[PDB]
Amino acid sequence: GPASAAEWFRQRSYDYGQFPPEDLARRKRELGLTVSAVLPSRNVADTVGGIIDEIHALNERAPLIDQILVVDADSEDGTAGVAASHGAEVYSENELMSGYGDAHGKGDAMWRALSVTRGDLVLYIDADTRDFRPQLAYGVLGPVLEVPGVRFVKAAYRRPEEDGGGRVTELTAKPLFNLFYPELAGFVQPLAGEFVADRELFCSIPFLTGYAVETGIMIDVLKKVGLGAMAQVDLGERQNRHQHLRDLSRMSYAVVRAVARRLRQEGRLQQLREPGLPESFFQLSDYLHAVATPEGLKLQEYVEELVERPPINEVLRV
Amino acid sequence: GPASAAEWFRQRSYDYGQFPPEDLARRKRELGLTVSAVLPSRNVADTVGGIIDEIHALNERAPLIDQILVVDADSEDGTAGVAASHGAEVYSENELMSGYGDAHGKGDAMWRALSVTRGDLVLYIDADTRDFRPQLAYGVLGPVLEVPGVRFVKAAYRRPEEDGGGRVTELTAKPLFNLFYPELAGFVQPLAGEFVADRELFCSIPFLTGYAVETGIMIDVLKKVGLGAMAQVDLGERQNRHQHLRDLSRMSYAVVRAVARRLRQEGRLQQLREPGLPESFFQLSDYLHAVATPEGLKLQEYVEELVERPPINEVLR
Ligand SMILES: Nc1nc2c(ncn2[C@@H]2O[C@H](COP(=O)(O)OP(=O)(O)O[C@H]3O[C@H](CO)[C@@H](O)[C@H](O)[C@@H]3O)[C@@H](O)[C@H]2O)c(=O)[nH]1
Ligand SMILES: Nc1nc2c(ncn2[C@@H]2O[C@H](COP(=O)(O)OP(=O)(O)O)[C@@H](O)[C@H]2O)c(=O)[nH]1
Ligand SMILES: [Cl-]
Ligand SMILES: [Cl-]
Ligand SMILES: [Mg+2]
Ligand SMILES: [Mg+2]
């Protein structure tokens, strides 16, 4: 493969500039591949309509996306109606794989989407992007279509001068990756919502639910296809919606848990619970967040079970 | 001890308002204890003066700090001169424990200060605070003085509703503590630079050099004296710096490195290098930071070793 993250970063980082969409459209036509775009959507009424439009506008210049799926979290904001009125196929995350009960977050929606994706290639895109430029859809298709061994491509980009990701990327994922999965240290936006791979690949790895899904997918793909078969594409600028630091804390915990879970199955981490530690202190699903408030110090408690879905291949009608 | 972070939280969180300085001064005197205040300092000529001044004013009201140590990273802004001019003792981080060579960052300075601290208690204080109110000095002394079994006290506070700390604390320390050291999850500012413990405790644990020092101390104190012997005190509002996110990434890494190390030693973590990963990818002191710029993607590469100084006890006295 590649001797280092440095070597990979050399050979496997592209620019959307290198993949004009008419070329891709042509190449895609030649290969007879179809693409499904999947938009995990939760209260994005104000933005999905615009994204669906832009993908349609792009398909006019260059036929690249055959299916547009909005997988809705039963948003209270009318998201589903909005996406439907703009021409996307819309599904409820709770109606897909209904045998699994209600969806546990973004990861669960993304997994369940596989049950109705018809494309040879599955392309995930975030539904909340404000100013959606067309390369936020087609850029990552470049290397899958054009570079021989590449099976999985993640987006790279910058906040509208040097961007190393949002807070969770910078302070959680990158430090955890550098230490535990150094092979992934080369990725500019390892937690990006926009990335693409063949449907068969996604269908044959498990999916962490909740916010841990990207982290889990990075690790699982790395292990399945190898570093040389992953790539990234600079896509330019991408405005993302800032979250409250306090909520990001919970996301950071999900990323930690995903890494910890994987380390444990590799055997690098054993006896996760330190001996001598009374069981009462031990409950992974129980996140304690101590804060200071105008009226005193408080201990907030969040409970999120780390639910993991099996490779959908194993659980879905063949 | 306590049965959960929640029980600890109710029993070992206080408000500085519970500890009027004049009462602290009385108890300190009855117990014959002395307090050393260490200010690890690098380029803070603009703020040390104020801090030192506040401490001296506090002591007039209530004699609480017996020694003020500015341990200076040989700043070029004249930190040393200001501190000296304002009445504080001044030391070069490089001259203390010089057998270990020049100093590896903030932790090293804090460790080396243990060789010149005369107090029974040692109070570390950040020297870059813009608006130093009295309770930043005395608040954390409350529980060590007043609650016999308490040996270690961390500050708690909030920026100018709910505040769960700075970016590194929220996105790195607290996630990691919740998973691997649940006993520390009740701390509001576990990475706070204001904390106090008895000299003997500090002299009995190792100190990570650099940015990981607070994380290491939290963990090693926890293992050494137990969660019951730790406390926090609400000091009110403290204004915070806006370090750059790109710099904070290296800091988060140090924090992760520190936890990982402790996990290796406990046996929880082994074969840290994936069994099948070429040594070309394996260099813990080598942090790869991939970034996007106007000119394209760049892979930045920082280096900082993790250095652990042993307990000063093993080298001294
Ligand atoms: N169907 C569904 N969609 C969801 C859910 N939660 C979030 N989404 C959608 O998934 C997209 C991104 O989720 P964000 O909550 O906006 O994530 P982020 O703050 O932008 O942070 C980033 O890092 C995460 C780490 O994994 C990523 O998951 C995420 O994609 C994003 O890149 C958005 O379109 C959002 O509506 C859910 O529970 N169900
Ligand atoms: N003596 C010494 N002091 C330092 C060093 N680095 C930081 N400090 C001081 O430690 C305090 C906090 O520094 P810093 O780590 O930047 O604070 P933070 O970014 O808010 O966590 C300040 O008073 C700094 O001047 C160092 O290498 N040597
Ligand atoms: Cl787990
Ligand atoms: Cl769980
Ligand atoms: Mg977003
Ligand atoms: Mg817990």
Side-chain angles (χ1 to χ4, degrees), chain B residues 5 9 141 166 228:
Chain B
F9 187 91
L141 297 178

Side-chain angles (χ1 to χ4, degrees), chain A residues 2-6 9 13-14 156-159 161-168 170-172 174-176 178-180 182-183 185-188 223 227 232 234 245-246 248-249 252-253 256-257 260 266-274 277 280-281 284 286-294 296-300, chain B residues 2-6 9 13-14 156-159 161-168 170-172 174-176 178-183 185-188 223 227 232 234 245-246 248-249 252-253 256-257 260 266-272 274 277 280-281 284 286-294 296-300:
Chain A
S4 55
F9 181 93
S13 306
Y14 304 90
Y157 47 69
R158 105 188 70 106
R159 51 170 49 109
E161 184 61 13
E162 179 180 295
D163 191 23
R167 284 161 293 175
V168 173
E170 285 282 53
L171 314 195
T172 320
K174 282 165 167 173
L176 291 172
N178 266 263
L179 206 149
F180 291 118
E183 275 166 340
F187 283 89
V188 187
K223 290 165 145 199
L227 188 47
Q232 70 184 336
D234 188 357
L245 193 58
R246 87 176 59 108
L248 287 177
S249 198
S252 281
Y253 188 56
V256 173
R257 293 208 53 187
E266 293 154 11
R268 289 200 271 169
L269 187 59
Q270 54 204 27
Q271 40 152 339
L272 179 34
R273 173 236 282 264
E274 223 188 349
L277 207 244
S280 36
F281 273 99
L284 293 180
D286 198 39
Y287 189 66
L288 302 191
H289 191 253
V291 304
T293 74
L297 300 177
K298 306 180 185 307
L299 184 55
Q300 294 163 359
Chain B
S4 59
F9 187 91
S13 294
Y14 307 87
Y157 47 69
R158 64 178 138 83
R159 69 182 72 111
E161 3 64 79
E162 304 174 335
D163 170 15
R167 288 165 293 176
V168 169
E170 285 278 40
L171 311 196
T172 315
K174 278 167 170 166
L176 289 173
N178 263 271
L179 192 108
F180 300 119
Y181 298 101
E183 291 152 298
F187 283 87
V188 176
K223 290 173 160 165
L227 174 64
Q232 56 183 351
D234 188 352
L245 190 59
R246 77 203 70 166
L248 286 178
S249 193
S252 289
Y253 186 57
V256 164
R257 290 220 48 196
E266 297 153 7
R268 286 200 276 174
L269 205 47
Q270 46 197 45
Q271 56 173 2
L272 179 39
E274 261 280 68
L277 199 286
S280 37
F281 290 90
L284 293 185
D286 192 23
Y287 190 55
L288 293 243
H289 191 252
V291 295
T293 62
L297 306 185
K298 299 194 101 190
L299 186 50
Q300 293 176 316

Side-chain angles (χ1 to χ4, degrees), chain A residues 34 51 56 60 86 137 171 179 197 235-236 256 285:
Chain A
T34 51
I51 296 170
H56 285 149
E60 289 167 36
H86 278 262
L171 314 195
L179 206 149
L235 303 177
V256 173
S285 60

